[PDB]
A paper describes a structure:
Among the >600 human ubiquitin ligases, UBR4 plays a particularly important PQC role, being an essential and conserved E3/E4 ligase found across eukaryotes. Aside from teaming up with various ubiquitin ligases, UBR4 activity is linked to two specific cofactors: calcium-binding protein calmodulin (CALM1) and KCMF1 (13, 16, 17, 20, 21). Our data show that the evolutionarily conserved UBR4 complex forms a megadalton E4 arena, in which inward-facing ZZ-DZB domains of KCMF1 act not as E3 ligases but as substrate receptors. The architecture of the E4 megacomplex is conserved across eukaryotes, but species-specific adaptations allow UBR4 to perform its precisely tuned quality-control function in diverse cellular environments.
Because the ZZ-DZB motif of KCMF1 has been implicated in binding Arg N-degrons, we measured the binding of the isolated ZZ-DZB domain to synthetic peptides by isothermal titration calorimetry (ITC). No interaction was observed for the reported ligand Arg1-Cys2sulfonate, NRC(SO3) and, consistently, a co-crystal structure of the ZZ-DZB:peptide complex showed both R1 and C(SO3)2 sidechains protruding out of the binding pocket.
Residue numbers in the entry:
A (entry chain A): 2 to 121
B (entry chain B): 1 to 4
Amino acid sequence: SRHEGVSCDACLKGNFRGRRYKCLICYDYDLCASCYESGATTTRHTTDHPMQCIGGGGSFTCPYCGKMGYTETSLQEHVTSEHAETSTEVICPICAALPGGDPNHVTDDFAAHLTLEHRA
Amino acid sequence: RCKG
Ligand SMILES: [Zn+2]
Ligand SMILES: [Zn+2]
Ligand SMILES: [Zn+2]
Ligand SMILES: [Zn+2]
């Protein structure tokens, strides 16, 4: 999944995939996983600063039948199997349940959305 | 940076 609206303060990439590391000392300061693990610093940030990992987790509801308690992986297998060609519009639960994610990602091809925007 |  991509951290929509978030840009890395060291390499400047935005809407990046992977884990997001937020500094709890610097104002509005985030690093992508690569910059974090490599010890990148910019402006007033130091590697001693505590950081919060923001990311995955979660159980999700299938938008087509309402069954609950899927992981991201198990949701995709369930959808790509039992809801294969359904053209009914639904809102993505993964996008809505993740921080900064799109609260109303409407899609009429959920299986394809999962494969392209929620890669495992 | 978070813009939202
Ligand atoms: Zn970076
Ligand atoms: Zn910092
Ligand atoms: Zn279902
Ligand atoms: Zn989504």
